[PDB]
């Protein structure tokens, strides 16, 4: 269990690393809907999620198991797929980062 959470933390650090920054950056911080002019964001997305929040939860030992961690990372991608039309660049970025996540998550100890 501790082992599985270390795997999860490893994945998190990878998603935040420079290697993936070209497509990970939209997911680093909470969506600032006002700043981006997205005045419908919080009406469509009722459970915002982002990598800084996942990191805080990991650092605070909020996550009790790998499934809980994965549900939050996946929620983050789902919010992007819900809000944005599927041909938008940010959706392509989400799909690429989700590929990174899913392939490594699958190597669960
Ligand atoms: C075309 C305008 N679209 C938007 O503003 C939606 C927004 N779109 C982007 C976004 C990201 C990358 C590109 Cl190339 C174009 C738009 C976005 C950019 C951010 O920069 C700090 C943070 C969150 C974002 N994000 C996420 C996450 N989900 N939808 C969006
Ligand atoms: Ni899940």
Swiss-Prot record:
Domain Bromo: 1-108
Phenotype when changing residue 38 to A: Reduced binding to histone H4 acetylated at 'Lys-12' (H4K12ac)
Compartment(s) of residence: Nucleus; Chromosome
UniProt-reported outcome of changing residue 31 to A: Abolished binding to histone H4 acetylated at 'Lys-12' (H4K12ac)
Domain of life: Eukaryota
Complexes and interactors: Homodimer. Interacts with E2F1. Interacts with (acetylated) STAT3; promoting STAT3 recruitment to chromatin. Interacts with CTCF; promoting BRD2 recruitment to chromatin. (Microbial infection) Interacts with herpes virus 8 protein LANA1.
Family: Belongs to the BET family.
Note: Some specific inhibitors of BRD2 that prevent binding to acetylated histone are promising therapeutic molecules for the treatment of cancers or inflammatory diseases. ABBV-744, a small molecule, has been tested on tumors with success: ABBV-744 antiproliferative activity is mainly restricted to cell lines of acute myeloid leukaemia and prostate cancer and is able to displace BRD4 from chromatin. GSK046 (iBET-BD2), which specifically inhibits the second bromo domain, is a promising therapeutic small molecule for the treatment of inflammatory and autoimmune diseases.
Notes on the domains: The first bromo domain specifically recognizes histone H4 acetylated at 'Lys-12' (H4K12ac). It also specifically binds histone H4 acetyl-methylated at 'Lys-5' and 'Lys-12' (H4K5acme and H4K12acme, respectively). The second bromo domain recognizes and binds histone H4 acetylated at 'Lys-5' and 'Lys-12' (H4K5ac and H4K12ac, respectively).
Function description: Chromatin reader protein that specifically recognizes and binds histone H4 acetylated at 'Lys-5' and 'Lys-12' (H4K5ac and H4K12ac, respectively), thereby controlling gene expression and remodeling chromatin structures. Recruits transcription factors and coactivators to target gene sites, and activates RNA polymerase II machinery for transcriptional elongation.
Name of the protein in its database record: Bromodomain-containing protein 2
Organism, as annotated: Homo sapiens
Gene that specifies this protein: BRD2
Range within the parent protein: 346 to 454 of 801
